[PDB]
Design a binder for this molecule. Structure first.
Ligand code: IQL
Length: 148
């Protein structure tokens, strides 16, 4: 048995990127940037958590059919940083992450987990910075950590 994830202090968000280059850059330098409202959502979650548990980011490239890994948020959002470092030159800001897990996990392994906060749509049908309820997040993390 593996009962690790079945902890009650953490928040988990889907990260959806159009750009494979951004993913590579994120892994290399341990940074990310979302949209304006996405950054705001993540920033509120990180500040409200106050170190008492992780903010997890589940990364997936739009159209790829799989998730590509997991990172933990490691800083609040700095909104005034060098522009043009990402795919689209109009992302504003930057925060630190630590990539915790880098591998492809097909959507088939996850489509049966549904998000009651998103009309019961499959977690694999989520938009950028969709938050995942903790009880569903535990199931997602378990499947990702044990896919071979
Ligand atoms: C670097 N940021 C991204 N590649 C992104 N893509 C879609 C929504 C939010 N962010």
């Amino acid at each position: 048995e593996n009962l690790y994830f079945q902890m009650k202090h953490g928040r988990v968000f889907i990260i959806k990127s159009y750009s494979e280059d951004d993913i590579h850059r994120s892994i290399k330098y341990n940074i990310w940037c979302s949209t304006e409202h996405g950054n705001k959502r993540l920033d509120a979650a990180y500040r409200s958590m106050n170190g008492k548990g992780p903010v997890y980011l589940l990364f997936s490239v739009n159209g790829s059919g799989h998730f590509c890994g997991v990172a933990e948020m490691k800083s609040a959002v700095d909104y005034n940083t060098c522009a043009g470092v990402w795919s689209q030159d109009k992302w504003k800001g930057r925060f630190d992450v630590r990539w915790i897990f880098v591998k492809d996990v097909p959507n088939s392994q996850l489509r049966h987990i549904r998000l009651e906060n998103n009309e019961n749509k499959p977690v694999t049908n989520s938009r950028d910075t969709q938050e995942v309820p903790l009880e569903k997040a535990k199931q997602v993390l378990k499947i990702i950590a044990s896919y071979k």
